[PDB]
Amino acid sequence: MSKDIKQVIEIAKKHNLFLKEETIQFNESGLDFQAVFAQDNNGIDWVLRLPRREDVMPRTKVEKQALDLVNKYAISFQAPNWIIYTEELIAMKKLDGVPAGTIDHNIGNYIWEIDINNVPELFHKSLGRVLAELHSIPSNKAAALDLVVHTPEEARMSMKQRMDAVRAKFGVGENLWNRWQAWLNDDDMWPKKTGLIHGDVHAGHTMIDKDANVTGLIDWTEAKVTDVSHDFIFNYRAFGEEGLEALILAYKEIGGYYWPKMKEHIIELNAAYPVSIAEFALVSGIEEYEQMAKEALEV
Numbered sequence: 001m002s003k004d005i006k007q008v009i010e011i012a013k014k015h016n017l018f019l020k021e022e023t024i025q026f027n028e029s030g031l032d033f034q035a036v037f038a039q040d041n042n043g044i045d046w047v048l049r050l051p052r053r054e055d056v057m058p059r060t061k062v063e064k065q066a067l068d069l070v071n072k073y074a075i076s077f078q079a080p081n082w083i084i085y086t087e088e089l090i091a092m093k094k095l096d097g098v099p100a101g102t103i104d105h106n107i108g109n110y111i112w113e114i115d116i117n118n119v120p121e122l123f124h125k126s127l128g129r130v131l132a133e134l135h136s137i138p139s140n141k142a143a144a145l146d147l148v149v150h151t152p153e154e155a156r157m158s159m160k161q162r163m164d165a166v167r168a169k170f171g172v173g174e175n176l177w178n179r180w181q182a183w184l185n186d187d188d189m190w191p192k193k194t195g196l197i198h199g200d201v202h203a204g205h206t207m208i209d210k211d212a213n214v215t216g217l218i219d220w221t222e223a224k225v226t227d228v229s230h231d232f233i234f235n236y237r238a239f240g241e242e243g244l245e246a247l248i249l250a251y252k253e254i255g256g257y258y259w260p261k262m263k264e265h266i267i268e269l270n271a272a273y274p275v276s277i278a279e280f281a282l283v284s285g286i287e288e289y290e291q292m293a294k295e296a297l298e299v
C-alpha cells in the first residue's frame, strides 16, 4: 500500500493537489478506475479516480456532459464537479453526507445507513424534489450533446429492441416474455414525455444528511434522456410499493411529470429488470451476472 500511496501523492502533487498521506484510503474498485479517498491540506475531502484503461476522455465524455448540465442547472442536489480532469487523474471534492446504503455482494443486499423498517419520509420527499428538478433540466438547450436522447416513442422502441436482443442472446422464459410484450403493447401505460435521467439511482449513489434528506447524487455514467421511470425503480425494489408510491407522490406534487398509469408502468419496468442484468452480464462477462441473468430471465 505504501507503494500505491506514494504514487497517489505523486500523481496528485502533479495536479497541484496536496494530500494528507495518513488519510488516503483505497476503495474496492472495478476495471475502469481505482477510487481513492483522501483529505487535502485545506481540510477538504476529495475523491480521486486513478484510471485503469486507455482513452479516458472518449470514455468519460458522456458522463462529463451530464455533470456539466446538472452543475449548471440544479440547486436541490450536489453532483460531482471534476476540478481535475486529465488522462492521468480525475479528482473532485467529496459530496456532503453519506450513502443511504452500500451493496454487500456476498448477501445480495444492502448495508443500510437508514432504518429500513422505518424509512424516513424525508428520504422520499427530498428524492422526489431532486428527481423532479433533474428530469426538468432543459437538455435540449445544449448545442452538442452526445448523450443518448429518446423521444417517448423512441424510449418505448428502445425497450422493445433491448428485449429482443435478450431473447436472442440468452433466451427468455416464455411466461416472462409474454408479460413484457403485454407491457410494450399497452399504449396508455407508456409515458408521453422523457427527460434527463441519472440512470443508476440507488442507495449507494444517493448521499443523505443526518435526517435522511437526499443532498447529492454520484456516479452519472448512465445519464441519458429517456423514460424517467428508471430513476424510481430503486424505491420500489428497496422499499416496496409504499416507498414507490411515496416517491411518485412527492415528485408529482412538486411538478414532476405524471400520468395515470405511472405506478403500473414502473412496476412493469421492474418486471423487465432481467433485461439489464442480462446486458451487464453480456458486457462485463461476469458469470454471477450470467447466472443471475439466467435465473432472472427464467431460462
Ligand SMILES: CC[C@H]1OC(=O)[C@H](C)[C@@H](O[C@H]2C[C@@](C)(OC)[C@@H](O)[C@H](C)O2)[C@H](C)[C@@H](O[C@@H]2O[C@H](C)C[C@H](N(C)C)[C@H]2O)[C@](C)(O)C[C@@H](C)C(=O)[C@H](C)[C@@H](O)[C@]1(C)O
Binding pocket: 103, 104, 105, 107, 108, 109, 110, 199, 200, 201, 202, 222, 230, 231, 233, 234, 237, 238, 273, 276, 277, 280
Ligand atoms: C433492493 C436490493 C437490491 O438492489 C437493487 O435491486 C437495486 C435497486 C439495483 O438497481 C436496479 C435499478 C436500476 C435503475 O439501477 C439503479 C437498474 O438499472 C438495475 C438493473 O436495477 C442495483 C443497483 C443493481 O445494480 C445495477 O445493475 C445494473 C445492471 C448496472 C448498474 N450500474 C453499475 C451501471 C448497477 O448499479 C443490481 C444489479 O441489483 C446490483 C446487484 C449487485 C444485485 O443483484 C444486488 C444484490 C441487488 O439485488 C440488491 C442490493 O439486493
Ligand SMILES: Nc1nc2c(ncn2[C@@H]2O[C@H](COP(=O)(O)OP(=O)(O)O)[C@@H](O)[C@H]2O)c(=O)[nH]1
Binding pocket: 027, 029, 030, 035, 047, 093, 094, 095, 096, 097, 098, 099, 204, 207, 218, 219, 220, 221
Ligand atoms: N461518501 C461519498 N462516497 C463517494 C463519493 N464519490 C464516490 N464515492 C464512493 O466511491 C465509490 C465509487 O465511486 P463511483 O463513481 O460510483 O465508481 P463506480 O461505482 O466504479 O462507477 C462509490 O460507490 C462511493 O461509495 C462521494 O462524493 N461521497
Ligand SMILES: [Mg+2]
Binding pocket: 205, 219
Ligand atoms: Mg458506482
